[PDB]
Amino acid sequence: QIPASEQETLVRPKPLLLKLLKSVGAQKDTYTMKEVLFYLGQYIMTKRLYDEKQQHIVYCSNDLLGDLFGVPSFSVKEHRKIYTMIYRNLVVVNQ
Ligand SMILES: CN1C(=O)C(Cc2ccc(Cl)cc2)=C(c2c[nH]c3cc(Cl)ccc23)[C@@]1(O)Cc1ccc(Cl)cc1
């Protein structure tokens, strides 16, 4: 899974990921990973990216999320893969 310490990592989304988060009502510039995942959840649900037949799949090929993450789809069960994709779109804030 993902260690608790790592969920609490402080991060500053780069401009395009920040715009995506703000488009679903995020207000800040600095987040924990846990908060980033919250707003991605909202984004995904709002843009209706979940596959109808296989609900664990986010089909993001035709969406900005697919451009940022660099994949046509991902499974919500693949946490480490997701954290890897997110990290490419942010800067980690020391301590
Ligand atoms: C379908 N969902 C989940 O499986 C988890 C848990 C999850 C997902 C990805 C990773 Cl890397 C880790 C954990 C969710 C949520 C994640 N955080 C939340 C907070 C609230 Cl308050 C509600 C749902 C969720 C969510 O509800 C929504 C979701 C959030 C982020 C991503 Cl990338 C995909 C889906």
- Residues 15 and 31: their CA atoms lie apart, in Å, by 14
Using the 8-state DSSP alphabet, how is residue 71 labeled? S
CB 74 within 8 A of CB 58: yes
3-class state of residue 82 by DSSP: helix
CB 69 within 8 A of CB 90: no
Q: Considering only CA atoms, which residue is closest to atom 10 of ligand 1?
A: 79
Q: Resolution, rounded to a tenth of an Å? A: 2.0
79-to-1, 2, 7, 27, 85 alpha-carbon distances in Å: 7, 7, 11, 25, 10
Residues contacting residue 52 through CB under 8 Å, at least 6 positions apart: none
Q: Considering only CA atoms, which residue is closest to atom 29 of ligand 1?
A: 41
Domain 1-95 architecture: Orthogonal Bundle (1.10)
HEC profile of 10-56:
EEEECHHHHHHHHHCCCCCCCEEHHHHHHHHHHHHHHCCCECCCCCC
Which residue is associated with the tokens 């109808």? 52
Domain boundaries, the chain: 1-95
